C-alpha cells in the first residue's frame, strides 16, 4: 500500500462594536482530519503471490 452563513451564525460575543479576537487564518484551516489506511494481509499476500507467479 501507501460557509459564510455558518460563519455568521457563530460570531457572537467576541465581536460587537469591538474588533474580532484573531488576526487571520494561517492556511485553509485544519489540515483535513487525516486518512487512516486499512488493509487485510491475506489479499495483499495473495495478489503478491499472483504477480510473482506471473513474473516467474
Amino acid at each position: 500500500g501507501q460557509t459564510n452563513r455558518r460563519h455568521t451564525a457563530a460570531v457572537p460575543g467576541p465581536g460587537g462594536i469591538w474588533s474580532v479576537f484573531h488576526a487571520g487564518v494561517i492556511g485553509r484551516g485544519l489540515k483535513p482530519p487525516k486518512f487512516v489506511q486499512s488493509r487485510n494481509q491475506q489479499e495483499v499476500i495473495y495478489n503478491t503471490q499472483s504477480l510473482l507467479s506471473l513474473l516467474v
Partner: protein, 293 residues
C-alpha cells in the same frame, strides 16, 4: 516515586518563579531526567494545535515572567520556544533551568527547540560560562547544561503545516525527511545541514548567499516558496534577528520572524511579540513591552 518527584519538581517551579537559583545536585537530577525525556523525541516533533509559539528569550528572566503573564501560565497554555535562551542576559541559569523543569514537568505542554547560542563554544565565549562561574562556583553545571543543549530537538511541526525552527533553511536540506535523518546527537558544526538550520536567515535576495555571521547561509523568497511547495507547508516560523515590532512577515507571507525578548541586551528598545495559534490554526499576535525593574 512519581508522586515525590512530581511534588519536588513543582516546588522547584515555585522556587524558580521567585528568581532563586537551585543547587548542583538538583540540577544534576533535573538534567538527567531531561536527558531521559529528550532521548525519545524526533528532530521534527509534531506539536498539535493549539500552541503559543514564543521566540528568543536570551536570558532575560523577568521578561520571561512577563511573557508568562501575557500568554498564559505554563500549566494551561501550550508553548513552543525556538531556542536561544542562554546568552546575552544577566539571569541566564534561571531561564534555562525554568524551561527545562517546565519541560520535564509538562511533557506535552512545553516544546523546547535548540538555538545556535546553545552550544559549548558560544556559551563559553558569550557569557553563560562566566555566569556559571559567578553563581554556582565551578564549571561542572555548565557541562550538564551543554549536554542538555546537545540533546535538544532541532525543529517542530504544527499540524503538518507550520514549520518552526530557530534559524533558516539550508542548501543541503530539500525535504523534511532529511531533517529527521540527521544525527542530532552532536555539537553544532561550522559547516553542514544543522549549522545552517540553526544559523541561516532570510533576506530580500534572489538566491543563496554567504551570511554576514561567519556561519550559515541566507535565502530569499524563491527558496522559501520552493521549500513550502515541495513539503506541503505554508509557513516557516523562526526567531533569529532583532525586530522592533516583534514580528515580521517576510518572503511574501511565508517566513515569520517572532522575537520574544523585549529590550534586547537591555539597550535596543524593541517591543517583543509572540504568536498564538488557536485550535482552528486561527492566529493572533501578543505584543508586549519589557518588564519594570
Amino acid at each position: 516515586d512519581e508522586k515525590v518527584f512530581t511534588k519536588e519538581l513543582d516546588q522547584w517551579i515555585e522556587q524558580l518563579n521567585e528568581c532563586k537559583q537551585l543547587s548542583e545536585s538538583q540540577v544534576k537530577s533535573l538534567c538527567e531526567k531531561a536527558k531521559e525525556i529528550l532521548t525519545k523525541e524526533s528532530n521534527v516533533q509534531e506539536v498539535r494545535c493549539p500552541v503559543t509559539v514564543c521566540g528568543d528569550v536570551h536570558g532575560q528572566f523577568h521578561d520571561l515572567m512577563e511573557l508568562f503573564r501575557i500568554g498564559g501560565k505554563s500549566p494551561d497554555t501550550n508553548y513552543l520556544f525556538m531556542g536561544d535562551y542562554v546568552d546575552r542576559g544577566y539571569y541566564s541559569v534561571e531561564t534555562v533551568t525554568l524551561l527545562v523543569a517546565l519541560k520535564v514537568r509538562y511533557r506535552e505542554r512545553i516544546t523546547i527547540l535548540r538555538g545556535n547560542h546553545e552550544s559549548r563554544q558560544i556559551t563559553q565565549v558569550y557569557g553563560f560560562y562566566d555566569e556559571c562561574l559567578r553563581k554556582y562556583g565551578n564549571a561542572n553545571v555548565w557541562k550538564y547544561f551543554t549536554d542538555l543543549f546537545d540533546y535538544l530537538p532541532l525543529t517542530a511541526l504544527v499540524d503538518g503545516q507550520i514549520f518552526c525552527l530557530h534559524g533558516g533553511l539550508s542548501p543541503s536540506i530539500d525535504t523534511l525527511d532529511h531533517i529527521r535523518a540527521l544525527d542530532r546527537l552532536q555539537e553544532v558544526p561550522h559547516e553542514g545541514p544543522m549549522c545552517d538550520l540553526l544559523w541561516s536567515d532570510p533576506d530580500d535576495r534572489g538566491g543563496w548567499g554567504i551570511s554576514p555571521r561567519g556561519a550559515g547561509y541566507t535565502f530569499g523568497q524563491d527558496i522559501s516558496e520552493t521549500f513550502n511547495h515541495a513539503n506541503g507547508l505554508t509557513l516557516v516560523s523562526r526567531a533569529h534577528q532583532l525586530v522592533m515590532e516583534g514580528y515580521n512577515w517576510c518572503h511574501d507571507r511565508n517566513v515569520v520572524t517572532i522575537f520574544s525578548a523585549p529590550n534586547y541586551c537591555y539597550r535596543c528598545g524593541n517591543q517583543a511579540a509572540i504568536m498564538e495559534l488557536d485550535d482552528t490554526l486561527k492566529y493572533s499576535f501578543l505584543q508586549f513591552d519589557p518588564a519594570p525593574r
